Amino acid sequence: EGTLEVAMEYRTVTGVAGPLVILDKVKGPKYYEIVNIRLGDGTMRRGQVLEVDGEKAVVQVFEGTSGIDNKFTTVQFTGEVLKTPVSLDMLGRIFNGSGKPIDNGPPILPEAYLDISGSSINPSERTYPEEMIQTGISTIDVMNSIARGQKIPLFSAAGLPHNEIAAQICRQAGLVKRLEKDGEEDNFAIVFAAMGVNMETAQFFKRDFEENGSMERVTLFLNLANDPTIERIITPRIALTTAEYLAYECGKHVLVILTDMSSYADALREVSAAREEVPGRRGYPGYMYTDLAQIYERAGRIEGRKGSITQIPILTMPNDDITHPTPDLTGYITEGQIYIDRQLQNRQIYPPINVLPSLSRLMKSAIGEGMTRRDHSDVSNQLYANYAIGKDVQAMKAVVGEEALSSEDLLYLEFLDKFERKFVAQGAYDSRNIFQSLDLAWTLLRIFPRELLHRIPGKTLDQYYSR
Amino acid sequence: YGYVRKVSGPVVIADGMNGAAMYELVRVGHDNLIGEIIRLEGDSATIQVYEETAGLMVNDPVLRTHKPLSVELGPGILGNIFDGIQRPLKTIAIRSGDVYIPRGVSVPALDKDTLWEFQPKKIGEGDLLTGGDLYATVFENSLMQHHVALPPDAMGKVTYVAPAGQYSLKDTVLELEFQGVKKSFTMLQAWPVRTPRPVSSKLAADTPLLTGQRVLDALFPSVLGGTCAIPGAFGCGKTVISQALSKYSNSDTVVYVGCGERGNEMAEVLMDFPQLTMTLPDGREESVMKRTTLVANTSNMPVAAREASIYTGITIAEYFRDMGYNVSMMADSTSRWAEALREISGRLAEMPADSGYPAYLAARLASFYERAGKVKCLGGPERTGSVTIVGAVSPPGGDFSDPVTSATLSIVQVFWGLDKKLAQRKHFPSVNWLISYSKYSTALESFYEQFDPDFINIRTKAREVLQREDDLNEIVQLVGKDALAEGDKITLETAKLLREDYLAQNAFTPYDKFCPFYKSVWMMRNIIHFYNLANQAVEKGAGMDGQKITYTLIKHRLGDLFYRLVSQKFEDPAEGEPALVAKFKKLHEDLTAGFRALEDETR
Amino acid sequence: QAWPVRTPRPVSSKLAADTPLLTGQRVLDALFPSVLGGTCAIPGAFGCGKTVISQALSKYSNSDTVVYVGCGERGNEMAEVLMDFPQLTMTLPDGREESVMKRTTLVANTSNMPVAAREASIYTGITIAEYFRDMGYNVSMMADSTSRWAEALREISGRLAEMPADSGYPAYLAARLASFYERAGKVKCLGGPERTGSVTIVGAVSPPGGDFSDPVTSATLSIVQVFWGLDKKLAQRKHFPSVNWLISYSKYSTALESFYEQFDPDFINIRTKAREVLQREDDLNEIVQLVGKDALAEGDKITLETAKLLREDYLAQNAFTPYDKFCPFYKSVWMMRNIIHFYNLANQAVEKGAGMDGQKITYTLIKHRLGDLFYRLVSQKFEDPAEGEPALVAKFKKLHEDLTAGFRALEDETR
Amino acid sequence: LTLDEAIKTTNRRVNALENVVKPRLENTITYIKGELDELEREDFFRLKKIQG
């Protein structure tokens, strides 16, 4: 830090196509060098250097390419990668896609600058999800529960209220250990990143968080659909960096809500097409898996610090499918999957969660004696078995006829109806405790006879069958 | 020496190489990110970064190491955690207190300074020695005897052999003379990550793997030093089957090389390696960390590391098999490895063949999966080890025609195809008994004959019963159970008995945690014997009764035996093999008494 | 004044819209309503003639101004519009005759016109809509056949050798279409006085082959708030609106709750009940097709009844007859209330009828003895709106009360 | 009664099950081929032209 150097300033813009500008005769161009673009009109745009070769350097532009010309476009090379400012003061504020504040307030007075896509954590220093949290949703809390540091993506399609359930989860987020849990450190410090969302959904989320009373806790990063596409590829990275600082270097539990991963994949595809690389599945860039892994693996508990990051990236199935590359890779990476079913929506259940495909890989470790009753796993296994047998029985009754169905067949159909009616359905502003919720699950289970409950061990049966 | 010209993610062009070697490791930039050459074009070269590449500059120096990728083989590798670049992660975390892994860190794979005892095997001065001769042994820990051996490309006469003593890795202990030159030697030896270790001869496998799971051990047996294929599903398998290999497997050592996976799962399992000791030795409780080595590269790891980690793991496995120890290699990768090949092909602008996968995917998979077998080692004394490969593929939910799956099933001999429906059915083993198959069946004929000659026929009968149940499930779904006959009734009863008692192993309970082969064979024998007795009873059908009437009668009259056949699962293996064998023999005798008194009563 | 067409005209602020768009068509007005300034999408596969719906909206919406733009639209349609709008009159509170042609501007260029101009056409249309929005008026724009715009993007991008991301459509399709749809909304205008105008966008995404999995349809459904699903089944049956209830959905239902409550609290409950009845009707149709007409429950019979009545009367409008040309909201609410109240009376009769026979089994006999009232229920749609609000409301009160009295007396009879 | 039920089941199968599944298979084949194969070949050709 003896002496510094002022950034260069070039005018050699030999080609402008799409969201990219092709500089030339540039010397010493760093990779991912952050550039500031001064147009002929004087307005300043910021962009990134996607590729470096010889004296050439392909520069992507965040704010679009609607004013650049050879004669008067001047570009500077700051000689550094993106480093968003971060501090504790960043809380309770709303920011644009690139992190520029839009809360009509002042810019962030940084505590420090953190390079985006923060340093890789030594795997020998991570820790498994230790504690579990109460999500308020009966379907989420009782089965496929969410532990601190888990990666649970919600899978939805167009029209399904993924935004509404995301807002519900944000208000209902809470600890559960023995139903015990100021908790300012325990405050979830929700980081919400919305990419390519309709302005109506943006105002919806803004009002929902403003009325929630957590405006001193939550932090919103917005990249609307009308906003430039390139900005959307940085917004979740900025959110991850802010969460990492506020969690690790600030000692606060942090929950992350990433919105519309399909929109992020769209920006990735746009960038790849503009750069003209070899496609992957469905024309997507071949490295989309690496990008999603880097955007997902930045969460989890850490041994050396008291903080933790738990992320709930809502995902939009494009054609209401899973073979699409984005949901497929997300399932490959994320340790969970929550399904919102169009069939449930057709019957007008406000939480449409389809419990059958829902699963949490760390659910077994999440549930504990302190976290839940000792028979919670038995309840979950029994509910899976009963639902699967009931679906098979419903198909059999449909093919053979309603009358031809056996007595246990009608019992399974009644269980399905009562379950999908009372259990899955829940109110919109109503949260709920875990232990009596498990009691109600036992009510649904004791609807079936003791003999049929082969999945539940006899010990837990005697423990909680009669009640 | 050379300087960068083009930077595009993992691909970094370096002009000025001129004479450079294909796959020669080269350090790039001031941080010296280690990378390998993938494409020569003349003076220029193409280097995969093997690290984060942001922040490079044109004219940044590039240095040639002149040597292909190699992993340091020597004492002290067991119970350690390595990235695909062979970096001791715990050592990095300790030396540098920062929780992160610093960019371009250069730490030796094994600590030279650390001391280790020595024990020569009566080696004499002037003796002619050859590559792979187990001249000495070192106890890295209890129950682990690292027998240091001469490098495969090394032989001569022993001018000097060190006396037994405490030595650091940098220390020399053995001196050889050959062709009028003197070659010193340390414990650590370097071997290329490709080009498998030399083998005197490849041998036909003879002994099964004998895993804890019942279906894996009986229905789809796997020999020692043989390939395996699992679809890498969650909840079980990579958690359950892997745990069974880790603590319940007869393999001496496990090389877990998971790559391209969920990070939290590996965090938990790494937290589990020091714990979860298994008392396999008679007098000591073998902590599994002693008999395991983790090659961990999470999803955030660089793409080239995903390709490198598999070969590092198989090199370690070949090393262990050189000493004669039987070692298992579980690989959660080869699912994301194909993705890494796709990425590197896309950056290199190669033309894909099918669905975007580069063509040589099949060839590389064939090489890696054929790098395993029962091998007679080099040198003296004559010894034999094996390497068993268990590699994951795409999850069972997707189509099994995926190119990676198709390539694997071409070469792999045992596919333990898990079922999504079974997983949703909460059937924990989740192994499908229809798609799965084990081509190793013919080899184990002698083993099964010497163990129990009747086991083959009862296994075939169980397979036939399962096939009949699966076949007529469609019929009963369509037509209905009304037309089902007495033979069909007993067939369905036996099929349900199998699905509940036999194929289901919770493994979360002491009675179900591990199922020895003696208990598995007895349970199958009991089920098949009950099926045979029911068949004979319904076949008799005399005395103005029998057939379906006999089936209902034995269902009610002999309901106690049918009920306790299910409880036969709950019989605790820890009680001891003689006691369990006696109990099962008594149960078989009672079953013979059943359907015999029922034969006497003539319904 | 000249405005860069691509750039979006500035707004002081964007505010939530809470004024429903009164289409004048019962199905869209009630089942899947839209707010003023909202964003809508009409697939309208080949042969459905969505343009009649668009023209009906242009004629009878409550908008202050109409900006009709057709990209790829056939020339005859624009002739028809220009020849028929001037004669057609709309009645303001003053009541004087006035031509919607004054209220409407046409930006359309026919299919014969060069394809490169599709973008320019759509952007000029939307910027003219925005200009009228800044004036304080509430304007609605209809974008005929944006699929032609997508094809124009594909053709232009194809020449540039830009890589085809999906089915020839370039990667930057969702972005542009999203911007186009996002220029819509309800905003507080700039300057003084404090105008509050809006722009309503109701585009059209014609599915090639009639498969909604098409890329343009996929992106639209992704970024659209209210969606009206046209189907070939109803079009073939000459239903006329051809608005399938199942696929169509409105995300604006929550917002218009206040307006519905102040107008009529019954509307929410009757709307939900009608949706449930339609879903049950579809399920029962599937079950019967699987099994057969026989073994059909009397309660299921009552459910399928009056659901057939819904489909035949309330969900269908002729759109070319004086009575069905424009459906006022109040009479739509009355018809829906009549249908649901008949259904509820049937449920009550099933609950108690002095034995299971008279309760539900005799639903056929109830239909026989209530045939005149059921015919009045099915014919309530036939009346013209020219009778005036008092006449229609009095007639609907009389119909509802007569139906209730007759049903109760017949339910009282033999019970 | 049994013959009526069986005949109804068989006729329903022949008239609905196959008559719906066969169009499903045809649509799946048409979509799979005419989208995936066509667009993959087009992408490969465009890349080849780019290199050329």
From TrEMBL, chain A:
Domain ATPase F1/V1/A1 complex alpha/beta subunit nucleotide-binding span(s) in chain numbering: 136-360
Biological processes, Gene Ontology terms: actin filament bundle assembly; actin filament capping; ATP metabolic process; vacuolar acidification
InterPro entries xrefs: ATP-synt_VA_C, ATPase_a/bsu_AS, ATPase_F1/V1/A1_a/bsu_N, ATPase_F1/V1/A1_a/bsu_nucl-bd, ATPase_V1-cplx_bsu, P-loop_NTPase, V-ATPase_su_B/beta
Residues of the ATP synthase A/B type C-terminal domain: 366-465
Assigned keywords, A-Z: Hydrogen ion transport, Ion transport, Transport
CDD domains xref list: ATP-synt_V_A-type_beta_C, ATP-synt_V_A-type_beta_N, V_A-ATPase_B
Residues annotated as domain ATPase F1/V1/A1 complex alpha/beta subunit N-terminal: 13-79
Gene Ontology annotations for the cellular component aspect, listed alphabetically: proton-transporting V-type ATPase, V1 domain
Gene Ontology MF terms: actin filament binding; ATP binding; proton-transporting ATPase activity, rotational mechanism
Its biological purpose: Non-catalytic subunit of the peripheral V1 complex of vacuolar ATPase. V-ATPase is responsible for acidifying a variety of intracellular compartments in eukaryotic cells. Non-catalytic subunit of the V1 complex of vacuolar(H+)-ATPase (V-ATPase), a multisubunit enzyme composed of a peripheral complex (V1) that hydrolyzes ATP and a membrane integral complex (V0) that translocates protons. V-ATPase is responsible for acidifying and maintaining the pH of intracellular compartments.
Subunit-level organization: V-ATPase is a heteromultimeric enzyme composed of a peripheral catalytic V1 complex attached to an integral membrane V0 proton pore complex.
Family according to the record: Belongs to the ATPase alpha/beta chains family.
The protein's name: Vacuolar proton pump subunit B
From TrEMBL, chain D:
One annotated Gene Ontology cellular component of this protein: vacuolar membrane
Keyword Protein transport: no
Single GO molecular function: proton-transporting ATPase activity, rotational mechanism
Keyword entries, A-Z: Ion transport, Transport
Family per record: Belongs to the V-ATPase D subunit family.
Protein name per the record: V-type proton ATPase subunit D
